[PDB]
């Protein structure tokens, strides 16, 4: 299915290596790697005009690439530095039009003990909103997490729900001066008051966190913040 890049999420300690995969099955010759920092444009790292051919882009330093085949254009980070924290996008072109992978969110940390799983809590609709609007807003708050490698979703009666949902576009920083401040992220699910006031209805906010792996060595006296799902739930409420 198109340009596919892997991992979607990774945490590295300073000095470690990693390879970002990108595979393209459309027989495109021209392939590109970009990075994008928050709220910025895409900056070209390396590009390849065909199998066996690669050239430096705008920002190649600290990166390497290979193109032994038309299908694969791996990006290597040989020795991870904090400046390489970014989102990375691979693209191919054919006939002038570009096709992009989904992105790979990479965070490089100086110490793993700045990595934290989210705490998650659900806030139930207020009686006054129900009375006034005939609608019922649930709030999910996910707090205290680092990196911002999370996917928040709502599940109603066991099924992921998409309508009536709004998740903050940007997480917010608990300590805004700090470059590795832990984050807070809110979402809302709004339903008719009728649906919320049914005790048969089950509401769950889920945060999938992408954390450390067993390539990581953990020293701290807290649980190793591994990839994991933290949820919070509420039952519909008659009373």
């Amino acid at each position: 299915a198109g340009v596919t890049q892997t991992p979607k999420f990774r945490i590295l300690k300073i000095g470690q290596s990693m390879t970002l995969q990108c595979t393209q099955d459309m027989n495109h010759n021209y392939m590109y790697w970009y990075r994008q920092d928050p709220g910025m444009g895409l900056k070209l790292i390396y590009y390849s005009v065909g199998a066996g051919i690669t050239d430096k882009g705008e920002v190649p330093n600290g990166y390497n690439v290979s193109r032994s085949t038309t299908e694969d254009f791996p990006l290597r980070l040989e020795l991870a530095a904090p400046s390489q924290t970014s989102v990375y996008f691979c693209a191919s072109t054919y006939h002038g039009t570009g096709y992009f992978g989904e992105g790979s969110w990479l965070t490089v940390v100086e110490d793993l003990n700045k990595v934290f799983p989210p705490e998650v809590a659900v806030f139930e609709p207020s009686e006054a909103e129900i009375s006034h609007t005939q609608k019922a807003t649930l709030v999910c708050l996910a707090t205290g997490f680092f990196p911002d490698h999370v996917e928040l979703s709502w599940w109603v009666n066991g099924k992921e729900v998409h309508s009536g949902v709004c998740t903050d576009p940007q997480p917010l920083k608990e300590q805004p001066a700090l470059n590795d401040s832990r984050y807070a992220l809110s979402s809302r699910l709004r339903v008719s008051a009728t649906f919320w006031q049914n005790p048969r209805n089950h509401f769950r906010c889920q945060v999938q966190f992408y954390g450390l792996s067993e390539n990581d060595e953990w020293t701290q006296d807290r649980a190793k913040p591994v990839t994991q799902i933290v949820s919070a739930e509420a039952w519909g409420r008659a009373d």
Partner: protein, 196 residues
Amino acid sequence: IQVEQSPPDLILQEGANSTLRCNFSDSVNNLQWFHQNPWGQLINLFYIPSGTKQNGRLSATTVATERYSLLYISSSQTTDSGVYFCAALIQGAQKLVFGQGTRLTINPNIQNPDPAVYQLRDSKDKSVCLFTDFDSQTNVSQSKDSDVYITDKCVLDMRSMDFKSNSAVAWSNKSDFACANAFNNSIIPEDTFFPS
């Protein structure tokens, strides 16, 4: 060498017609437009070296002689929100290089404002404040307090009821925290409902 986009951002209402601009130097060509959605996925809008193209509600013109290109979005929908980039090939080189982007926010027309602030209890002592049902003209001020948190607004669509609404959320551990005070740190419309 460089692709320059403008305006730095554009905020409009559902229904409005949008124009974005890209100026480029004489060492690039083969211009393209992309939309990047809030989830970070880039999708090509046009390959547009010169002439004008149409794609449903969207259109694009490149006057390569005048070294610019224009992207038109007609009858803007909330789903048009995102960042719009132009990109061009540095000449000779097949180096595909991007501008800084224009952020586009398309706001819903709130049929029936009922701006209100509500307190919501934790499902499992702990509560949050919800400011909701305001028209799109309202801005939601950042917290002027290190440990009161205020989110920016977001648009939620209740699809099967054809209903969109704005909300922002605020919370704090503070002992003297009031929903009365959370969004009155800001200001709210002439009529915000504050129950109890």
